[PDB]
Design a protein around this ligand. Structure first.
Ligand code: HEM
Ligand code: HEM
Lengths: 51, 60, 446, 379, 78, 99
């Protein structure tokens, strides 16, 4: 662990953080859509036309 | 003067993450739109027969 | 206790003056007793059409073979008698003739250069002799694998463009060339506005300018019948050319992407990025411990005999990539690692490697510009390309501006999701198909 | 010419896998339990296929089908009890196998160990679903409680539970689903076993000493083949003793009364193999905590390689670690006993203490003791 | 990991007699029994004590549970 | 005091009984493998023979005669300097990687 607690690793982390956030957004949308989770979709415009 | 397609590439298609997010959102909206449109088409083709088209007569 | 900044400030400054005909006379003065004076001409294969391609190489071959004022032996005798070394180099974009000589021999050197540039005999018997020599030299150049793979890279990358043509030219053109074509080439491309007289070392700029006014003044920039050659931007075509010759011992592969022009500011960050990628040969002592990840892995697994990264820049386009020689069964692995390094620089470059690349670039810049010959070459090429000799202080400032963010930006612009141009020679069966190579140019994670 | 065993592709694979595989000479009888697991899996697959030739999965006919197998089918009782007791033998050998891996530090083969944990989960699921198939009182109610455990999961919860149930409660849909899954899972186990063997062959086999045995390797065909056959004969001895002499020793008698959804059996307990996890679950009062504890009981094997702080792979030369390991084994025996016994005053505290001690031994005590051992050996 | 190139070993000489010219069970009892006793002596110090604790807990647990089921006379007294 | 309990552990651990030495029983991770390949040939051959003899003894479930057991004082940590150097070099490489 102490090996990765270094400034260069922090730099790499900052570099990949937006990508990780985007992948998280992809995962969230995927989950909501696949399950048709109504709790989230209710707010989504013109997807609320269903249910 | 970038075209529409070049704009789409440089905005969403360049990095796979934004590509996947676009695919997911498009998937959701396309699912909704296609479902609505195809259902409309099928209903129109079968207009006058479907129970939803005639339930009002027997309901209430 | 001079510092690097102070040393850059103390560098002698190039003084550029222009003769009325358009010849630009440039000089950097040093205390050295030896000087290198040369004429750089903005003529090359990129300015040649199909039928006259290779005429520049022919003219270069026979330029030292005699003048109207002094016959063929006379020029060589004068040059050797004063102890000078006369040499010429022809590239796709530039042609140069430079004389290494003592400072006291500057006037005679300038006379000889003017005679070579202007009053070239182009005698027919010498033309036939040089024709035979050039055909033999083409046959010899077939052996040099690196030159062949780079010529293939230019052919496939800039197909349908004049840049694709080789400097030497096809053998058919060589045998079909005539005295009229060589004379026409000299008349069309050797013009005073397109020439630069550069000197380095113990040269006084006033004396050099006066000698230029004495000798080069007659040369004119007027084009006969107003037939003015017009520069043409060259299209970069992503393509793959594979000369599969399994008999060859090792496989040479050169892969490149379109790069900036000479004057584009993005050259400096790209040079820093290439320095980060680095260069490796089997004879390097550093081996596994070398900082370059590609070099370290290549040394550990003996993937490649040699690999180097090149940044070839032309006026409006350039070839940015690397050339690696490897075994038949290690090509795919080396390509994978090279593309991985490219994508790593594009996506997740770090400050430390950027500092290393900047330092390497600074050392290369300062070390290369050492001696009268490289300094004069830099002066001439900088005047022809940049229109100005960029001082080392300006180079240092531009390097210092480079940061990890800059490197990531420029590498993403030039290297990421861009169709590459690949040339392979030898046992290149394991070289991945172009679809796989293009797929490697982007990361599904990013 | 070439040797057909080496040259032919399928024969090449079989040869490298079993015939001329380099194996350490010193591996003891504990290493035979892997081949015993393989034999148990094959025997279970054949036995269950022959049972399925006479088993109908409808709730109306399931118990009657098992009675038909036991009585009318020629030698059907032999097959049915071979299956029932082979499940127990499978779990005995699995527990001994994982114990060998823990004791001799075989978990350092990371991918093999993880595939083994996956296999353990699959085998446990297979057995749990299979026990429902006779559709006895105990089968129905154990299924009810074990599936109702899933309701503790927040949010999805009841939705997931009813999806597995196929309805509001355990019923015909659940029985048929469990039959189909119980059929298909052993084949996935057979494929994961091939993956497991591949990963192990990448690194060879560990020895009881825990020191690399490349210097001393012997061909598997001339030695461990006859050793594994002897182990299989001993396993058949024990299993056939169970099947013939004491056919209903490891089974609860209340599985012979047809399942009645309106009446709870006098005691609801899982089979003996699940009893330790049942006790661990019962120890924690909160439902979600109990489910998470039950999952962690098995998943700690995943964390076992990371918790290895000793400089010696095997415990053969780690006496204090040996003492801790046997304490853990006794703790597992205690957890089994508690799970068998009802939830009353004496057993509740014993179960809580046993669960805490199990987790403590695996997580804290063993690494600290290993560090102390390293300090003792002047490391 | 083929048999040829597993590891590097030097100057080790091994003599092995055939199965047919040697007895299958040399001193199975004369030497086996003392060896087993030696193995048991070393192992029993470590394996046994943890299980001994379980027997105590099993006995105590069974006794305590039976005691709890037995009636408390004081409850029905008075 | 401490040497008493350390000597106890040395006897408690059986690697002396098999004729092994402490460094023979270390787990062969990458650092240990590099240390082994850095051993002088005499030390290496001694190591491999010791381990082979120990494996043979464990195969037949026998132990070396009492007089031939390794002594706690006579045990020599042959691999310790090489392994320490390997660990130090790895630490330096990690440190350079950190920043
Ligand atoms: C159906 C289930 C399984 C089968 C068929 C199976 C089969 C085998 C076989 C044949 C071996 C060869 C060595 C030996 O037999 O001792 C082996 C080794 C091994 N297995 Fe599995 N096993 C199973 C379950 C597991 C589980 C549940 C684990 C861990 C939780 C596991 C981890 C290992 C390990 C660590 C080894 C290394 C043995 C050594 O170091 O020599 N296996 N297994
Ligand atoms: C390979 C690992 C397997 C295990 C651990 C396993 C375990 C079990 C168990 C515990 C039972 C309940 C026995 C009882 O209480 O009566 C059972 C029943 C059954 N198993 Fe399996 N089984 C396995 C493989 C198979 C396979 C491959 C089939 C294929 C059809 C199968 C078919 C059956 C059937 C039909 C029953 C119901 C008949 C009966 O309960 O006697 N089993 N199994």
């Amino acid at each position: 662990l102490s090996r990765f607690l270094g400034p260069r690793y922090r730099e790499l982390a900052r570099n990949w953080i937006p990508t990780a956030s985007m992948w998280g957004a992809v995962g969230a949308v995927g989950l909501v859509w696949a399950t048709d989770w109504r709790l989230i979709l209710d707010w989504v415009p013109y997807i609320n036309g269903k249910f | 003067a970038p075209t529409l397609t070049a704009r789409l590439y440089s905005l969403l298609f360049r990095r796979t993450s934004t590509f996947a997010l676009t695919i997911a959102v498009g998937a959701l909206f396309f699912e909704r739109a296609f479902d609505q449109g195809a259902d409309a088409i099928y209903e129109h083709i079968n207009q006058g027969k479907l129970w939803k088209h005639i339930k009002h007569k027997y309901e209430n | 206790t001079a510092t690097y900044a102070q040393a850059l400030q103390s560098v002698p400054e190039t003084q550029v003056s222009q003769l009325d005909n358009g010849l630009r006379v440039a000089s950097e003065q040093s205390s050295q007793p030896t000087c290198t004076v040369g004429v750089w001409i903005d003529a090359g294969s990129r300015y040649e059409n199909e039928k006259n391609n290779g005429a520049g190489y022919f003219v270069e071959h026979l330029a030292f073979k005699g003048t109207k004022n002094r016959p063929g032996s006379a020029l060589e005798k004068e040059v050797e008698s004063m102890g000078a070394h006369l040499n010429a180099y022809s590239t796709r974009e530039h042609t140069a003739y430079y004389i290494k000589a003592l400072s006291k021999d500057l006037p005679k050197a300038v006379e000889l250069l003017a005679d070579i540039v202007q009053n070239c005999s182009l005698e027919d018997s010498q033309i036939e002799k040089e024709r035979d020599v050039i055909l033999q030299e083409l046959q010899e150049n077939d052996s040099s694998m690196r030159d062949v793979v780079f010529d293939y890279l230019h052919a496939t990358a800039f197909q349908g463009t004049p840049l694709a043509q080789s400097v030497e030219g096809p053998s058919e053109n060589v045998r079909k060339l005539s005295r009229a074509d060589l004379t026409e080439y000299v008349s069309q491309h050797y013009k005073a506005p397109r020439m630069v007289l550069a000197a380095a070392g113990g040269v006084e700029h006033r004396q050099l300018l006066d000698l230029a006014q004495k000798h080069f003044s007659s040369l004119s920039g007027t084009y006969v019948e107003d037939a003015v050659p017009a520069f043409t931007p060259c299209r970069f075509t992503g393509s793959e050319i594979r000369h599969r010759d399994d008999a060859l011992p090792l496989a040479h592969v050169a892969i490149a992407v379109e790069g900036p022009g000479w004057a584009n500011p993005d050259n400096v960050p790209l040079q820093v990025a290439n320095a980060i990628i680095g260069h490796y040969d089997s004879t390097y002592g550093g081996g596994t411990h070398m900082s370059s990840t590609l070099a370290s892995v290549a040394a550990t697994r003996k993937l490649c005999q040699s690999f180097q990264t090149f940044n070839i820049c032309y006026a409006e386009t350039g070839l940015l990539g690397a050339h690696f020689v490897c075994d038949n069964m290690s090509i795919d692995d080396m390509m994978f690692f090279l593309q991985g390094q490219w994508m790593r620089l594009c996506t997740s470059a770090t400050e430390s490697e950027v500092v290393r690349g900047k330092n390497i670039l600074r050392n290369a810049l300062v070390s290369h510009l050492d001696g009268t010959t490289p300094v004069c070459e830099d002066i001439g090429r900088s005047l022809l390309t940049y229109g100005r000799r960029i001082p080392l202080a300006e180079w240092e400032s531009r390097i210092a501006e480079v940061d990890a963010s800059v490197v990531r930006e420029v590498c993403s612009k030039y290297f990421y999701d861009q169709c590459p141009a690949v040339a392979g020679l030898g046992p290149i069966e394991q070289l991945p198909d172009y679809n796989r190579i293009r797929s490697g140019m982007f990361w599904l994670r990013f | 010419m070439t040797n057909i065993r080496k040259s032919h592709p399928l024969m090449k694979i079989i040869n490298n896998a079993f015939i001329d595989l380099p194996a350490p000479s010193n591996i003891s009888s504990w290493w035979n339990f892997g081949s015993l697991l393989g034999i148990c899996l094959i025997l279970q697959i054949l036995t269950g296929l022959f049972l399925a030739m006479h088993y109908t999965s409808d709730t109306t006919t399931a118990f009657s089908s098992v009675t038909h197998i036991c009585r009318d089918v020629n030698y059907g009782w032999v097959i049915r009890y071979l299956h029932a007791n082979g499940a127990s033998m499978f779990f005995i050998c699995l527990f001994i196998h994982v114990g060998r891996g823990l004791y001799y530090g075989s978990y350092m083969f990371l991918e093999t160990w993880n595939i083994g944990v996956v296999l353990l989960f699959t085998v446990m699921a297979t057995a749990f679903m299979g026990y429902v198939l006779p559709w006895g009182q105990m089968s129905f109610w154990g299924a009810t409680v074990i599936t109702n455990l899933l309701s503790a999961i927040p949010y999805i919860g009841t939705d997931l539970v009813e999806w597995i149930w196929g309805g509001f409660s355990v019923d015909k849909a659940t029985l048929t689903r469990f039959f189909a899954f119980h059929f298909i899972l052993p084949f996935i186990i057979t494929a994961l076993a091939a993956v497991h063997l591949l990963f192990l062959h990448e690194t060879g086999s560990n020895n009881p000493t825990g020191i690399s045995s490349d210097m001393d390797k012997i061909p598997f065909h001339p030695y461990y083949t006859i050793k594994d056959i002897l182990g299989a004969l001993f396993m058949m001895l024990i299993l056939l003793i169970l099947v013939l002499f004491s056919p209903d020793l490891l089974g609860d008698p209340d599985n012979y009364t047809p399942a009645n959804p309106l009446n709870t059996p006098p005691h609801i307990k899982p089979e003996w193999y699940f009893l330790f996890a049942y006790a661990i679950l019962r120890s924690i009062p909160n439902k979600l905590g109990g489910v998470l504890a039950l999952v962690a009981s098995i998943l700690i094997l995943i964390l076992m390689p990371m918790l290895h702080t000793s400089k010696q792979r095997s415990m053969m030369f780690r006496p204090l670690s040996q003492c801790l390991f046997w304490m853990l084994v006794a703790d597992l025996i205690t957890l089994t006993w508690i799970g068998g016994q009802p939830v009353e005053h004496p057993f509740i505290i014993i179960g809580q203490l046993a669960s805490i001690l199990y987790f403590l031994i695996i997580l804290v005590l063993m690494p600290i003791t290993s560090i102390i051992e390293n300090n003792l050996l002047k490391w | 990991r083929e048999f040829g190139h597993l590891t590097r070993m030097r100057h080790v000489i091994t003599y092995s007699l055939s199965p047919f010219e040697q007895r299958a069970f040399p001193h199975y009892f004369t030497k086996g029994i003392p060896n087993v006793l030696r193995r048991t002596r070393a192992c029993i110090l470590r394996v046994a004590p943890p299980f001994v604790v379980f027997y105590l807990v099993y006995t105590w647990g069974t006794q305590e549970f039976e005691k709890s089921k037995r009636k408390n006379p004081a409850a029905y007294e008075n | 005091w401490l040497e008493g309990i350390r000597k106890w552990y040395y006897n408690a651990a059986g690697f002396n009984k098999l004729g092994l030495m402490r460094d023979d029983t270390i787990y062969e991770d990458d650092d240990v493998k590099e240390a082994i390949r850095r051993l002088p040939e005499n030390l290496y051959n001694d190591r491999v023979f010791r381990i082979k003899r120990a494996l043979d003894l464990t195969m037949r479930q026998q132990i070396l005669p009492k007089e031939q057991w390794t002594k706690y004082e006579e045990d020599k940590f042959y691999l310790e300097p090489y392994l320490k150097e390997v660990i130090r070099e790895r630490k330096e490489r990690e440190e350079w990687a950190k920043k």
